[PDB]
Design a protein around this ligand. Structure first.
Ligand code: SU1
Length: 283
C-alpha cells in the first residue's frame, strides 16, 4: 500500500503506544515511548487515523507527513521523528509538547501554573515569530496560526503545529467552532476570509491575533461576536483594543500585523528582529 521510505521508518515494536493527548483538535494523537530512534526511550506524540477513517483521511495524513519531510527541522515547529507505515496502521511519530497548547498554557498562569513575566510573554511571541519565519522561508503558508495551534514542551519551547495540514479552503465551514467553542474565522485576514487568498501576509495578520492572545493570557478574540457580525466589523476596518498590561509598542506591532493593505504588513523576518530587540529590553 504505502511505499517504503528507509529515511523515516521505525519498527512497530519500537513504539510503545500510550495515553491519548488532547480532546481531538489535532485529530487522534497519543503519547508514546519510542525505544531507539537503541536502549533509550523517547516520549513522542503519535498521529494516527480513527477506525472509521476514510481513504481520503489516509491520503491527507500521508500528505501531512510528506509535507513535514520536505520542510525540514526547526526548534520552533513540531518536527517529524519517524513513521510506522508498513504492515499495519499509519503511525506518524512527531515531537511531544508536554505542556500542551499555548492558549491553555497562558490561561493557566493568570493571577487568581505560576505567573509569567513580561519578558516570558514577549519571549513567547519571539519563538512563534521564529517558527513562522522558518516556515515562510520554506514556502509554507500555515492558514490557521493561533495560540491553540502552538504547543509548549516541558522546557517551555513554543512549537507551531498543523503547518503541514491538508485542507480544501473552498470547503471551510465558517460556522464550525473550535473544540473550545471559538470561531476560527476570527484569526483570518480579511482577504483570506473574504477572497480565499492565503499568503504569508494573511499569516502575519493571524500573528497579530496570536500576539493579542498572549498579552491577554489566553484571551478570546471578539467574545459573543458571531460570523456575520464579524464580517461587518472587518468590512468597517475594526481593530481590537490594546490589551491592558501591554506596551504601546507591542500594540503597534499588532496594529501593523493587521494593516489593511497586505504589502504593508511586516514580514516574519522583520517581526523576529523587532521581537528579538524588545525581548532584550523587556523586564
Ligand atoms: C496536553 C497536550 C500535550 N501534548 C499535546 C499534543 C501534541 C503533542 O504533544 N505533540 C503533538 C504533535 C502534533 C499534534 C499534537 C501534539 C496535548 C494536547 C494539546 C491539544 O490537543 O490542544
Amino acid at each position: 500500500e504505502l511505499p517504503e521510505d528507509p529515511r523515516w521508518e521505525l519498527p512497530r515494536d519500537r513504539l510503545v503506544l500510550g495515553k491519548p493527548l488532547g480532546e481531538g483538535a489535532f485529530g487522534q494523537v497519543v503519547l508514546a515511548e519510542a525505544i531507539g530512534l537503541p536502549n533509550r526511550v523517547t516520549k513522542v506524540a503519535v498521529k494516527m487515523l480513527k477506525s472509521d477513517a476514510t481513504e481520503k483521511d489516509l491520503s491527507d495524513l500521508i500528505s501531512e507527513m510528506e509535507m513535514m519531510k520536505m520542510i525540514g527541522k526547526h526548534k520552533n515547529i513540531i518536527n517529524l521523528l519517524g513513521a510506522c507505515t508498513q504492515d499495519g496502521p499509519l503511525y506518524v511519530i512527531v515531537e511531544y509538547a508536554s505542556k500542551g497548547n499555548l492558549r491553555e498554557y497562558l490561561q493557566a498562569r493568570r493571577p487568581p501554573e505560576e505567573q509569567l513575566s513580561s519578558k516570558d510573554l514577549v519571549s513567547c511571541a519571539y519563538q512563534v515569530a521564529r517558527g513562522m519565519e522558518y516556515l515562510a522561508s520554506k514556502k509554507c503558508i500555515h492558514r490557521d496560526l493561533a495560540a491553540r495551534n502552538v504547543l509548549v514542551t516541558e522546557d517551555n519551547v513554543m512549537k507551531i503545529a498543523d503547518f503541514g495540514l491538508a485542507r480544501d479552503i473552498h470547503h471551510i465551514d465558517y460556522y464550525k467552532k473550535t473544540t473550545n467553542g471559538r470561531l476560527p474565522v476570527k484569526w483570518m485576514a480579511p482577504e483570506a476570509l473574504f477572497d480565499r487568498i492565503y499568503t504569508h501576509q494573511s499569516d502575519v495578520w493571524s500573528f497579530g491575533v496570536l500576539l493579542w492572545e498572549i498579552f491577554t493570557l489566553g484571551g478570546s478574540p471578539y467574545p459573543g461576536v458571531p460570523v456575520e457580525e464579524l464580517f461587518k466589523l472587518l468590512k468597517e476596518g475594526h481593530r481590537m483594543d490594546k490589551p491592558s498590561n501591554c506596551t504601546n509598542e507591542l500594540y503597534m506591532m499588532m496594529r501593523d500585523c493587521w494593516h489593511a493593505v497586505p504589502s504593508q504588513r511586516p514580514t516574519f523576518k522583520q517581526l523576529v528582529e523587532d521581537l528579538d530587540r524588545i525581548v532584550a529590553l523587556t523586564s
